[PDB]
Scaffold this active site. Structure first.
Site, PDB file in Angstrom:
ATOM      1  N   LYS A  22      57.215  21.237  38.500  1.00  0.00           N
ATOM      2  CA  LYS A  22      56.133  22.065  37.987  1.00  0.00           C
ATOM      3  C   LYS A  22      56.671  22.966  36.896  1.00  0.00           C
ATOM      4  O   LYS A  22      57.808  23.417  36.978  1.00  0.00           O
ATOM      5  CB  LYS A  22      55.525  22.962  39.096  1.00  0.00           C
ATOM      6  CG  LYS A  22      54.053  23.232  38.856  1.00  0.00           C
ATOM      7  CD  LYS A  22      53.245  22.016  39.259  1.00  0.00           C
ATOM      8  CE  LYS A  22      51.760  22.219  38.971  1.00  0.00           C
ATOM      9  NZ  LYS A  22      51.007  21.011  39.365  1.00  0.00           N
TER      10      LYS A  22
ATOM     11  N   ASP B 226      47.893  21.512  34.534  1.00  0.00           N
ATOM     12  CA  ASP B 226      47.422  22.278  35.689  1.00  0.00           C
ATOM     13  C   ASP B 226      46.499  23.391  35.141  1.00  0.00           C
ATOM     14  O   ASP B 226      45.839  23.191  34.111  1.00  0.00           O
ATOM     15  CB  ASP B 226      48.628  22.809  36.468  1.00  0.00           C
ATOM     16  CG  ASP B 226      48.264  23.338  37.861  1.00  0.00           C
ATOM     17  OD1 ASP B 226      48.086  22.529  38.804  1.00  0.00           O
ATOM     18  OD2 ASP B 226      48.219  24.591  37.997  1.00  0.00           O
TER      19      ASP B 226
END
Ligand SMILES: NC(=O)C1=CN([C@@H]2O[C@H](COP(=O)(O)OP(=O)(O)OC[C@H]3O[C@@H](n4cnc5c(N)ncnc54)[C@H](OP(=O)(O)O)[C@@H]3O)[C@@H](O)[C@H]2O)C=CC1
Ligand SMILES: NC(=O)C1=CN([C@@H]2O[C@H](COP(=O)(O)OP(=O)(O)OC[C@H]3O[C@@H](n4cnc5c(N)ncnc54)[C@H](OP(=O)(O)O)[C@@H]3O)[C@@H](O)[C@H]2O)C=CC1
Ligand SMILES: NC(=O)C1=CN([C@@H]2O[C@H](COP(=O)(O)OP(=O)(O)OC[C@H]3O[C@@H](n4cnc5c(N)ncnc54)[C@H](OP(=O)(O)O)[C@@H]3O)[C@@H](O)[C@H]2O)C=CC1
Ligand SMILES: O=C(O)c1cccc(C(=O)O)c1
Ligand SMILES: O=C(O)c1cccc(C(=O)O)c1
Ligand SMILES: O=C(O)c1cccc(C(=O)O)c1
Lengths: 459, 459, 459
Positions: free
Chosen positions: A113, A153
């Site tokens: 991430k 995201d």
């Protein structure tokens, strides 16, 4: 001895660890405690300065991140978040979750991430372009189609993916599947925009079918959703398509609730989509039609939707972490909610989870509220990113029907794996629903832990 | 301010630009003028010296080129031309065309072109080998399976592809789909030799079916072809297979015409193929059977076939650029030609195009001669190269039937896209055929322009 | 067969070739004709699109170039020119010259040149920064401390070098001597700003000392200079320091001449330097003190200084190519000019050179005007860049005195080599000065040609 406090990461870790301890996993294989200590320290983290020029010519500085958490099962995979809250703690919680989520898809994707504390709100498209150019100028050293494959995201749409992809190609001089969520003409996948919201709803369909012995479905159910971005929009669309009613959406400034019986329409979702493309709040559109119709819509400033929707059958938090408190969880139970699945990553507070799980153990069968964790229910997005990678490696696109069918099979397998794993390692009292959080955690963790052992990461 | 004159490139640019201006494209989206200015300057050009040793031990010097024009849709893709005319202007016209052609295939391929002023005629196979070795020694720094994938254009056959591929592997130490037109045992695709000629004929089949409302086909039609290399040979074979007659082939020294009614036979095409493998002229085989039969064949030195074939229904220039003059275009119209499609890149002079298009606007339906540009009609070659890349990335070959079926679908989609795009943006008077040149140009350009915008190449 | 016309490159080539033919070089070593054919085709040329954003947010497009001409003696070396005239022809003339110039320094530097048609005039510093960032984003793939080391030619100052260096470091993640003309705290060399102008004057000192048997020097001489940038400024300063008078400077809009007897002062040169840092014309400062003093200064719009300076002893064209016509050469001769040396690359037209050389052969000893070509006289800049590279590789800076001493030795050796080579291969009639253009060309060419043979570039 002197590690910094990372609350979000610690929360994610503690919940995983607790579910592993509250099972027979470590009785049968106590060596897996070693795997847990190793897996919980990321393989690599890159942080970097991002200097960019605003529309006035001023120097601006933001911070860039990529957490490359685990690569036992495949190259690092997970989104980029551009939001002012972003820091290492948040990205570590997300990347840690990502490892086990990715394992549950059945595809070969490691967990990662990244993102930035850059806030797209209040920026021009030109400013976003310059920021993405600067950001990828550094990030492109560390990623690649067989290394690390990011995507969008929170705060990162197809627009940002495009600017990022462009700059990567410019520097690296390779045209490859280094990002997913790409556009249709430049390596994107059909169904990727829809994937997370669709997948959450697909997963809940299996939950409903199991808990009610095939007697109920989404048809006629009332579904409270939070957020109004990518996950919320398409979750809402799928609910509507299955004959359910969508009775709430929200954003960071308030909730937009359906007043009484009724639903958001696909046309209304499209208008909200266009508003969010422009980075505007729901508050900015309630002064005109159709959202000024106070008999259909109630806008509540500063509120989450959970206590304002009245009776609901399904709750799908789809905004951000820790967006269902302990109180709100009790209210949803009192409102008749029997199904709660996380669209958002770590959407439920720990208090909420404990409330939902206590309730499951106290109430037999369909009387229980059944909680599904994000790593199981929201895995459709990353799964379809995996299929975008597959399509890019084949150099050929698939049809909408092909991608959607695979997505459906993946969500079915994920549900079954979590259900059967919970049944085997954390067997519930007769008539009690197995814990999908426990089962999902064990199933994801053991797959990763064993691959790590095979590859010599621990012994 | 001080740019050099590049006549061929300017011609290609001007024709594209004119067709865009003569439509509603820039009325609806005037910002696309910015895209045109950006797209028309190549992303990268490499030029290099090629020193090689002749069979006498003498030093020889030639010039090498690779134009990497646009990569919005994929890695750079297009052939290598070895011909004494080669310079930057020519390769830029070809690479510019390539961008939009590639866009029309529906595959992820950017536009490029390269080659050398090296003349394979008069060289030994050993000399060609040494030249290819030297050439690729430099070119291999700049190309790769996910970067730039060349193949063989004029003067570059499977023989040269082999020598080039060998040297690439030797230096780069990677066995990958960096070239297409490869041999069957070392990563080639079935149907690639056939692809361009077959594709041109497939495309014209759709033209005939549309213009004549399904009443006619290639069966019984007379087809004048120019050139006698890869495109001409297989275009001729497909025509024959569909029951049409091939009434001409040519090379740089003259034309070989069918005398009266009749056709080249597949056996005769094979003999011509073997002659061209040996880099010999048609003039060298007309002194013996079967080509000395003056009742079947007339060899005309220094001539193009167009004014010497008598009545013809279809013209497929398949040799080189600017090989149909304004005069020759009028003669073909007067000879009853109703279909002209470019096998060769920029086969028609601008005068020819203007003549064909004026004629289309003056004559309703099947009375018009219908012109299809090379970027639409000759796209079968690069399309099948795309499928060779796909096969190489899958590590598995496909059957002849699989490749041919995909090729057929690609040519159908390309025709439809150009037809429907012309209908929408450059709507013809009722009963008039839509402009396939205008439609093809708009369809290719907009796809590229929008991908470029998505990726931040312009804003 | 089909090469484009490159007038500037052809001019440079023709003059070199003529001087080689008009000597005994090819009588003794006719094989060197092969070397000339090979050396004259550049090893590599990169061209690329440069998209950059102006202060209004508009897309701008320019063309970028790097000619990597010859690397027999070392990594490619030469400046970047940002000027609206820039094209491949110009950069090839410059890069071709560079090969032989570099050879004359005695340092291990190959020949290259690059730049852009970007015009720094009228741009903000912010616009120049964005342009340099975009430009180097591509160029950094092709250059490096042991590959190709650029620097600043026309339009490229320490400011642009800084922005270029910054972007290189950002992408390549290496801090190395990839550019010269760097700033004092980040790898620059003392004496580099001064080097070209100082070197030209040092070289002419040897010319004066030789032609006049040590009887004259710069003391008391009148020196006409053109341009007012880096070369002109420091040439002027050195002349002044040696007790000479600087009687002209110019820019693209006109000449600023000393009115009568007198000189530019160091203080006035500094003011002109500051004006040029701001990218302003000499025309913009003649309306105020000290340059409004019409008894000291005459500004002549649209003129070169040569016909307006009256009597002069030395001419140092220091602006751009082809800035002394045939007529102007005759005028300088008539004005008593006995020494002409090119600060600028190819400063003299061919007509001028022929005039100067005819005059040398017709007039014995100090009666002749003596022409020194740029590849000899302006080599101080690249020489000191070589020393900047040496300092960067040692990781230690040298003193001003160390660098200047080496520069002096290099200019002395270069003069001697050209003089002695001319004496040996193109022996003048007794009492006639040897041709420094012929000697310099032969000396540079043979060194390169023989190194090429040693390394297998030709045989
Ligand atoms: N996109 C995907 O494929 C995947 C997404 N997820 C997760 O789903 C959730 C939503 O992501 P996504 O729809 O893609 O993102 P989007 O940016 O498209 O939308 C995010 C929504 O959540 C709101 N939101 C974001 N942060 C906050 C915050 N701190 N406080 C209050 N509201 C907030 C936003 O409101 P506002 O506009 O006002 O800021 C917006 O309505 C995230 O948790 C994400 O990690 C999970 C799996 C896959
Ligand atoms: N091969 C492919 O897949 C593709 C090819 N094209 C284009 O098709 C055309 C033919 O290419 P291809 O068949 O592959 O090449 P080949 O080299 O196999 O054959 C070329 C033919 O055209 C003749 N020719 C080439 N240049 C000239 C010239 N200046 N003047 C007169 N005749 C010439 C040749 O005659 P001779 O032998 O005497 O020189 C030969 O008969 C080209 O325009 C090419 O760019 C378009 C799409 C795909
Ligand atoms: N810098 C170095 O180390 C070396 C430079 N040279 C050569 O010296 C010459 C000057 O370079 P440099 O001083 O560094 O460059 P600068 O840019 O600092 O200065 C160039 C000067 O020449 C003028 N000029 C440039 N182009 C033209 C043109 N087309 N027409 C009329 N005037 C022009 C400029 O006027 P304006 O400002 O109005 O445009 C300016 O006064 C060039 O030929 C260069 O290649 C040779 C060896 C080393
Ligand atoms: O890798 C992805 O496509 C992606 C994008 C956004 C979110 C997530 C996630 O699983 O949370 C994955
Ligand atoms: O990329 C190719 O296979 C190729 C080869 C020869 C010609 C062409 C073309 O489209 O003109 C493409
Ligand atoms: O390499 C250099 O430092 C350089 C810079 C500017 C000009 C020249 C030249 O020799 O013309 C060299």
């Amino acid at each position: 001895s002197n590690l910094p406090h990372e609350p979000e990461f610690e929360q994610a870790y503690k919940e995983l660890a607790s579910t592993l301890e509250n099972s027979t996993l470590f009785q049968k294989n106590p060596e897996y405690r070693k795997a847990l200590a190793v897996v919980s320290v990321p393989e690599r983290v890159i942080q970097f300065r991002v200097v960019w020029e605003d529309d006035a010519g001023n120097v601006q500085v933001n911070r860039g991140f990529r957490v490359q958490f685990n690569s036992a099962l495949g190259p690092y995979k997970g989104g980029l978040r551009f939001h002012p809250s972003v820091n290492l703690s948040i990205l570590k919680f997300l990347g840690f979750e990502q490892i086990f989520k990715n394992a549950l898809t059945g595809l070969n994707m490691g967990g990662g991430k990244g993102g930035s504390d850059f806030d797209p709100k209040g920026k021009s498209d030109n400013e976003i372009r310059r920021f993405c150019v600067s950001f990828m100028t550094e990030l492109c050293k560390h990623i690649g189609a067989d290394t690390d494959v990011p995507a969008g995201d929170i705060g990162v749409t197809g627009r940002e993916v495009g600017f990022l992809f462009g700059q990567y190609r410019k520097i690296r001089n390779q045209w490859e599947g280094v990002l997913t969520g790409k556009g249709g003409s430049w390596g994107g996948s059909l169904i990727r925009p829809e994937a997370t919201g669709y997948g959450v709803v697909y997963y809940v369909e299996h939950m409903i079918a199991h808990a009610t012995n095939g007697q109920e479905s989404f048809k006629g159910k009332r579904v409270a959703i939070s957020g109004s971005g990518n996950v919320a929009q398409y979750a809402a669309l799928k609910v509507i398509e299955l004959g359910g009613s969508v009775v709430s959406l929200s954003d960071s400034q308030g909730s937009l609730i359906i007043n009484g019986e009724g639903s958001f329409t696909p046309e209304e979702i499209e208008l909200i989509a266009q508003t969010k493309v422009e980075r505007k709040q729901l508050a900015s559109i309630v002064g005109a039609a159709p959202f000024s119709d106070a008999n259909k819509f109630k806008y509540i400033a500063g509120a989450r939707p959970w206590v304002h929707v009245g009776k609901v059958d399904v709750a799908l938090p789809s905004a951000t972490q820790n967006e269902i408190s302990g109180e709100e969880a009790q209210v949803l139970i009192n409102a008749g909610c029997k199904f709660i699945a996380e669209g958002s990553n770590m959407g439920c507070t720990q208090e909420a989870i404990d409330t939902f799980e206590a309730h499951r153990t106290a109430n037999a069968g369909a009387a229980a509220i059944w909680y599904a964790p994000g790593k199981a229910a929201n895995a459709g997005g990353v799964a379809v990113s995996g299929l975008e990678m597959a399509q890019n490696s084949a150099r050929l696109s698939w049809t909408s029907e092909e991608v959607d069918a695979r997505l459906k099979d993946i969500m079915r397998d994920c549900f079954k794996n979590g259900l059967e794993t919970a049944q085997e390692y954390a067997t519930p009292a007769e008539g009690v629903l197995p814990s999908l959080v426990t089962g999902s955690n064990i199933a994801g963790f053991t797959k990763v832990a064993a691959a790590m052992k095979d590859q010599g990461d621990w012994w």
